[PDB]
């Protein structure tokens, strides 16, 4: 084309909300395995499982921090109908504003 | 207490920007190894090296996707002075808004 192409960042388009789900490892492992069958239509793209480090204590998050990117708020809202959330995890939907 | 603490998501406070650095893997590996000494004050918390999947193409990102959360905009700006960015990689500052 030009090439004035990509830095490989996918959150660019202005309605790329990320559900960050910091569920407990075993439960997230079960969750993703269970979800992928019927509840593929609950996301477009997602990560693997990952972990975040802390600063001062010798700590990580032991919890598997998955990141889920949907355009549709219908995916977020029809969530509880089609795949209701288990307790033990919490979900947090962050709306991504590209700043540059 | 509660203990109504975390869901373990570190983007909560209204000034947690994420630099999402999708450098080539070897470059990301060299970047951090070089950076960590003097350019520790380029970040507060940051990730490991993660990767994204593609949807319909049988690919991932081969490039390594680190995510960097600093409070300061001085962090992003005194960046180019103290550690000027190499070419070949890209960075993106996504300023994160919690929706819920």
UniProtKB/Swiss-Prot annotation, chains A, B:
<feature type="region of interest" description="DNA-binding domain">
    <location>
        <begin position="15"/>
        <end position="100"/>
    </location>
</feature>
<comment type="similarity">
    <text>Belongs to the papillomaviridae E2 protein family.</text>
</comment>
<protein>
    <recommendedName>
        <fullName>Regulatory protein E2</fullName>
    </recommendedName>
</protein>
<comment type="function">
    <text>Plays a role in the initiation of viral DNA replication. A dimer of E2 interacts with a dimer of E1 in order to improve specificity of E1 DNA binding activity. Once the complex recognizes and binds DNA at specific sites, the E2 dimer is removed from DNA. E2 also regulates viral transcription through binding to the E2RE response element (5'-ACCNNNNNNGGT-3') present in multiple copies in the regulatory regions of the viral genome. Activates or represses transcription depending on E2RE's position with regards to proximal promoter elements including the TATA-box.</text>
</comment>
<comment type="subunit">
    <text>Binds DNA as homodimer. Interacts with protein E1; this interaction greatly increases E1 DNA-binding activity. Interacts with protein L1; this interaction enhances E2-dependent replication and transcription activation. Interacts with protein L2; this interaction inhibits E2 transcriptional activity but not DNA replication function E2. Interacts with protein E7; this interaction inhibits E7 oncogenic activity. Interacts with host TAF1; this interaction modulates E2-dependent transcriptional regulation. Interacts with host BRD4; this interaction mediates E2 transcriptional activation function.</text>
</comment>
